């Protein structure tokens, strides 16, 4: 009937980290210290260049939905982000693919925030004066 460790309806926090080389769909509880299920883009594909494709990101956001249902998690807060430390602050193509797939799997989407870490005053950046030629 009910697996051990599950509960009734509960709220989780979904951390959708999407670069141009991977896509992390990681969900925890409101505390953030305890994580339920984490599936990346590369967990669902056998090619290194497909680790960022929307299909891989959308697929990895479907097992997270079904595992959250098993654990009793019925809603998720979304914190989308990309590798925006000193690099491009734009999350990759897999950021939106996972979010729509999460909602299309009959899950309640709570608040959504862009927590891409912008630097107040940063360090040097890779590339040099002439950049990446």
């Amino acid at each position: 009937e009910v697996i051990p460790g599950s509960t009734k309806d509960a709220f989780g926090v979904a951390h959708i980290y999407a670069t141009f080389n991977d896509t992390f769909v990681h969900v925890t509880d409101i505390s953030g210290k305890e994580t339920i299920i984490r599936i990346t883009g590369g967990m669902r594909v056998k090619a290194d260049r497909d680790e960022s494709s929307p299909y891989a990101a959308m697929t990895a956001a479907q097992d997270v939905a079904k595992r959250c249902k098993d654990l009793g998690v019925t809603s998720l807060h979304i914190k989308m982000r990309g590798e925006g430390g000193v690099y491009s602050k734009t999350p990759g193509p897999g950021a939106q693919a996972a979010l729509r797939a999460l909602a299309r799997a009959n899950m309640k989407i709570g608040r959504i925030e862009d927590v891409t870490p912008i630097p107040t005053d940063c360090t040097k950046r890779k590339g040099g004066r002439r950049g990446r030629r």
Partner: protein
């Protein structure tokens, strides 16, 4: 010879301005010479904004927007079609 009267920059009464990093190349470009573009975008795109509204846990939640300012160099601003080569008379336009 001289293609631009301002020499492609926007500095007049100063001698030095701090460098910044190009958005695409990460290349050191002067602050006044850089191509400044301010972009406003919703976090959830228009194709998927509906699907979130079908299953929302809040009453009057409005989806926020992303606020980022990007700076490009001339070499990549042209390549990315941010700016284009203009006519000799059309170069003087500033609108």
């Amino acid at each position: 010879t001289s293609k631009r009267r301002n020499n492609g920059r926007s500095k007049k009464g100063r001698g030095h301005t701090q460098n910044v990093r190009c958005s695409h190349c990460g290349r050191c470009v002067p602050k006044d010479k850089a191509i400044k573009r301010y972009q406003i975008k919703n976090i959830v795109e228009a194709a998927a904004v509906r699907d979130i509204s079908d299953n929302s846990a809040l009453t009057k939640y409005k989806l926020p927007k992303t606020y980022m300012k990007l700076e490009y160099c001339v070499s990549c601003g042209i390549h990315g079609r941010v700016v284009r080569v203009r006519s000799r008379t059309d170069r003087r336009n500033r609108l």
